[PDB]
Design a protein around this ligand. Structure first.
Ligand SMILES: [Co+2]
Lengths: 203, 228
């Protein structure tokens, strides 16, 4: 919102760019940062690690009740069955949406998010607006921001990631999808549905 | 450690800004800030809990409205100065130089295979914080506990909105690096970890949603029997 004290976005970017280039130059001279290291990190989280991975997990759970049991028992180990795991998802706990319960995940203290299955979080998840409100008014927030009405009689559970446990939502399987292939089913799974701010896609 | 960053339950921060789509990185400087995390971690600037505490010490108005990866830059500089690895005066001079000469080259340097290996191993192998300890857990599923009212100045994971609140233990996870010690440079000192369920009425008062609860992770020293 408006802050009369605030510089333009262009000026802020110009300043940050100079500050970061300065710090970069010093860490390069220390021998601890290089152009190939920078490029490798960017490439992994632009193109290798992203929410298509979590979608594979969700559709396996939807189509394999034993795997779903293992996933809810120990998310890290189940995901490793699919070759999925690593940084900022060393400890995953998946939680199951049902007709009786809706789950939504937040990091109120910062930005914690299950990178191995969702990639890096979108900016709104890391920002104070979502973080401050979702623990306090989650029903109203889901309705107002995401167009998602959770009836008052249905329980909402908000998982605040204060530790290195990383919570991931297993959304319910949409109706009208009986016997679909894993590939078709994955087209319904979104990062939002694995944060809990939207259901999986209908139809 | 009662900083503004601890925003759970804060009112008046405004509507969510959520564009229809967005790139992973909005500018090249963000890629640099991001890759500086494994670089400064490997080089011993800070561990994860210390990283967070650096961000927690920002000017809160700057924190509330700056691009996210700027927070990361602040904590690198914080710990670079703390450990004597970054000279502030030199950083200031170089900042002005790159203000004036934005297309000036980066310093000549050698590429290092070991840094690529480090990145791949961290990303796909992880940096697990689980540890084994000699004591069994003090608490178990179903125990009714109260969260501490302590208010340390240093790093902790004690959100103001859960302090002094009761709650029910929902799951023991095992022991993990303890932030109170780790984030203040006092080592891992691992403690058993629990998820605790707090009702919305316990957190927000009698008018709270009777059909909502918040699950929050509590290291063992954070909770005592609220006595059941
Ligand atoms: Co966080």
């Amino acid at each position: 919102t408006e802050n009369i004290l605030r510089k333009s976005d262009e000026e802020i970017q110009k300043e940050i760019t100079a500050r970061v280039k300065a710090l970069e130059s010093m860490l390069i001279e220390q021998g601890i940062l290089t152009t190939s290291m920078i490029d490798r990190m960017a490439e992994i989280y632009e193109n290798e690690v992203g929410p298509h991975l979590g979608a594979k997990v969700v559709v396996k759970a939807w189509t394999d009740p034993e795997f779903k049991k293992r996933l809810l028992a120990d998310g890290t180990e189940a995901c490793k069955e699919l070759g999925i795991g690593g940084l900022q998802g060393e400890d995953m706990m998946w939680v199951e949406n049902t007709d009786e319960v809706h789950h939504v995940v937040v990091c109120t203290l910062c930005s914690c998010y299950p990178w191995p299955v969702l990639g890096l979080p979108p900016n709104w998840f890391k920002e104070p607006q979502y973080r401050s409100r979702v623990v306090r008014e989650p029903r109203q927030l889901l309705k107002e921001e995401f167009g998602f009405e959770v009836p008052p009689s249905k329980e909402i559970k908000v998982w605040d990631s204060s530790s290195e446990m990383r919570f991931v939502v297993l959304p319910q399987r949409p109706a009208g999808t009986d016997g679909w292939s894993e590939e078709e089913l994955a087209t319904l799974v979104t990062r939002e549905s694995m944060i809990g701010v939207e259901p999986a896609k209908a139809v | 450690m009662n900083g503004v960053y601890d925003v759970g339950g804060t009112d008046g921060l405004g509507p969510i800004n959520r564009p229809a789509d967005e790139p992973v990185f909005r500018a090249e400087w963000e890629k640099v800030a991001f890759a500086m995390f494994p670089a400064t971690f490997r080089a011993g600037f800070m561990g994860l809990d210390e990283f967070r505490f650096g961000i927690e010490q920002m000017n809160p108005a700057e924190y509330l409205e700056s691009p996210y990866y700027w927070h990361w830059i602040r904590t690198y500089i914080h710990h670079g100065v703390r450990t004597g690895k970054i000279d502030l005066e030199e950083l200031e001079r170089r900042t002005q130089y790159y203000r004036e000469n934005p297309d000036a080259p980066l310093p000549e340097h050698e590429q290092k295979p070991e840094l690529i290996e480090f990145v791949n191993q961290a990303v796909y192998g992880g940096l697990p914080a689980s540890r084994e300890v000699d004591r069994p857990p003090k608490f178990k599923e179903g125990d009714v506990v109260r969260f501490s009212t302590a208010s340390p100045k240093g790093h902790a994971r004690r959100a103001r909105y859960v302090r002094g609140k009761t709650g029910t233990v929902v799951k023991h996870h095992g022991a993990y690096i303890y932030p109170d010690t780790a984030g203040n440079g006092l080592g891992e000192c691992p403690e058993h970890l629990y998820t605790v369920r707090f009702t919305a009425q316990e957190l927000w008062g009698p008018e709270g949603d009777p059909n909502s609860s918040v699950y929050y992770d509590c290291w063992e020293p954070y909770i005592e029997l609220v006595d059941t």
